[PDB]
Amino acid sequence: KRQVASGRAYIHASYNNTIVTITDPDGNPITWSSGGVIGYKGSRKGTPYAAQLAALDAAKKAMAYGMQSVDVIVRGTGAGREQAIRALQASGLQVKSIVDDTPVPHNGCRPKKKFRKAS
């Protein structure tokens, strides 16, 4: 399969799970992983450890395509943000630079009762 020397690592870190997708320099997925993709189920998929496993899985899967360094892009604030980040650093696979690009409306749609409790 194609050689991609470097590209991008997206950490989507939610309260409920962490997913990691790895892409070529243009943002087309190369491989991905997650708490479900490792063995875990439901609640455990959250957990900083799941995050680690998943980041590591996604990286190792991607080094297979001879990928060797990445830019990191984090999204969410969630139990596993920084484990996913430390994991990519410790994965070999050189981490060029971390950016947080979590989205935020410039006040937009009414949220679900769940995320409104502050009246």
Binding site: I98, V99, D100, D101, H106
Partner: protein, 70 residues
């Protein structure tokens, strides 16, 4: 810190084209800085917020940036 007013001489804070000055009033996330940081007065900051927004619509200033190294 430093105060962003203490870094300049006379500037027309109604001049919505002066990106070089106007820009020094945004964060690294490109958000209008609080007065805690700008060192302007209420009256002034009111006129600034108005001019920056104009610059923005014109394409000369950001609405947001991504935070680098988080």
């Amino acid at each position: 810190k430093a105060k962003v007013k203490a870094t300049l001489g006379e500037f027309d804070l109604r001049d919505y084209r002066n990106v070089e000055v106007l820009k020094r009033f945004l964060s690294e996330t490109g958000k209008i800085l609080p007065r805690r940081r700008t060192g302007l007065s209420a009256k002034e900051q009111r006129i600034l917020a108005k001019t920056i927004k104009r610059a923005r619509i014109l394409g000369l200033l950001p609405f947001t940036e991504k935070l680098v190294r988080k």
